[PDB]
Amino acid sequence: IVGGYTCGANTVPYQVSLNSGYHFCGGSLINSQWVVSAAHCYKSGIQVRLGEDNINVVEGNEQFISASKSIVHPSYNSNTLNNDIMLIKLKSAASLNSRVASISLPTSCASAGTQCLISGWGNTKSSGTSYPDVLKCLKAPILSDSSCKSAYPGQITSNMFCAGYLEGGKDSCQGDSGGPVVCSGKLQGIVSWGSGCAQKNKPGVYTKVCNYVSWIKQTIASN
Ligand SMILES: NC(=[NH2+])c1ccc2[nH]c(-c3cccc(-c4ccccc4)c3[O-])nc2c1
Ligand SMILES: [Ca+2]
Ligand SMILES: [Cl-]
Secondary structure, eight states: BBBBBEETTTTTTTTTEESSSEEEEEEEETTEEEEEOOOGOSSOOOOOEESSTTTTTTOOOOEEEEEEEEETTTHHHHHHHOOOOEEEEEEEEEOSSSSSOOOOOOSOOOOOTTTEEEEEEEEOSSSSSOOOOOOOOEEBBBBHHHHHHHHHHTOOOTTTEEESSSSSSSSSOOTOOOEEEEETTEEEEEEEOOOOOOOTOOEEEEEEGGGTTHHHHHHHHHH
């Protein structure tokens, strides 16, 4: 997260770190046995780490669970990143409490101007690599579809939206992929891609979750 602030320990209780010996992507807990992340974060040997703040120190509240299976959207396109969403089933259910909690799926899509919270352990420099130990947060608005399409001509599908600042300075960055974009307490986006980090006129692009709720529900109901 570039230009964000320190969230504060466990203030984003649905945030998870996908780990394979190091943190490589974020995710969101949507119930006690399932996480939602980005399809391009897929790999084997994923350990989901819940209740984290400093990902390099065990401070208490952490729950480390292995993924039993990861379901990449069947229509995921790695060249366009269209349908960049993945569901992860946990080996055992997580113990939910005030520090580990799930976030709700939306009933409707959000409107441009809606302010959302983006969090993660990704890079905090636009020009360079600085990875934080604790969770960072950024409040950012969803942009209109015209500004998004005008920024990334030919690359935005109906399953994506832009959120961010066109002046630059604040944005999600590498290490944040797969994590949550929460607006009014509902998960509206998943960190997906962008051109650099916090560059002027190149906002971040997110996966539009409101378009996959029946898919998430039917898939979870059959697995
Ligand atoms: N500017 C942005 N809003 C942004 C957001 C998420 C990103 N994630 C990445 C990213 C960059 C290099 C590699 C990966 C990657 C590739 C495979 C697996 C996991 C991460 C990224 O997610 N760049 C990103 C840029
Ligand atoms: Ca920790
Ligand atoms: Cl277009």
